Swiss-Prot record:
Phosphoserine modification, residue list: S23, S83
Record's keyword terms, sorted: Acetylation, Cytoplasm, Lipid-binding, Phosphoprotein, Transport
Protein name: Fatty acid-binding protein, heart
Annotated (9Z)-octadecenoate binding sites: R127, T128, Y129
Biological process according to GO: brown fat cell differentiation; cholesterol homeostasis; fatty acid metabolic process; intracellular lipid transport; long-chain fatty acid transport; negative regulation of cell population proliferation; phospholipid homeostasis; positive regulation of long-chain fatty acid import into cell
UniProt domain comment: Forms a beta-barrel structure that accommodates the hydrophobic ligand in its interior.
Binding-site residues for hexadecanoate, renumbered to this chain: R127, T128, Y129
Residue numbers carrying N-acetylvaline: V2
Name of the gene: FABP3
Amino acid sequence: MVDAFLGTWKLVDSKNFDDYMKSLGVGFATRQVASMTKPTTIIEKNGDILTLKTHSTFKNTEISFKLGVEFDETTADDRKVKSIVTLDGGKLVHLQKWDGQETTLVRELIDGKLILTLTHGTAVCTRTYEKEA
Ligand SMILES: O=C(O)CC1CCCCCCCCCCCCCCC1
């Protein structure tokens, strides 16, 4: 039931992303640039393989995965993690594990907007994306 997440999405609001990045140990210069970057996220499916692209003027990433199947990932901040993405309560939940640490990247649809909640430690960041035509 991932279909409503598919498409091209643009960042239109960000709350507490610096706190999230700081919690992950991201350096101040990268945080500075990141705080002024507006990514485009593209979510595509081919059968039961999802591909999630994050494009920006600063960093770009791409992951492909099957729901519910662990995959290796190297994040935009260069963490090497073990990841799984699932649907839970209609939300796309991406869990990353490394060094006994965890972070979740939770996507939900609210009134047509895609709300991405990033949690690590006590830091909770909420980013809002709107759908591009
Ligand atoms: O998808 C999001 O909106 C958040 C992730 C991507 C951010 C891409 C733009 C800025 C690059 C920042 C690099 C250091 C922090 C990366 C944290 C994980 C990816 C967040």
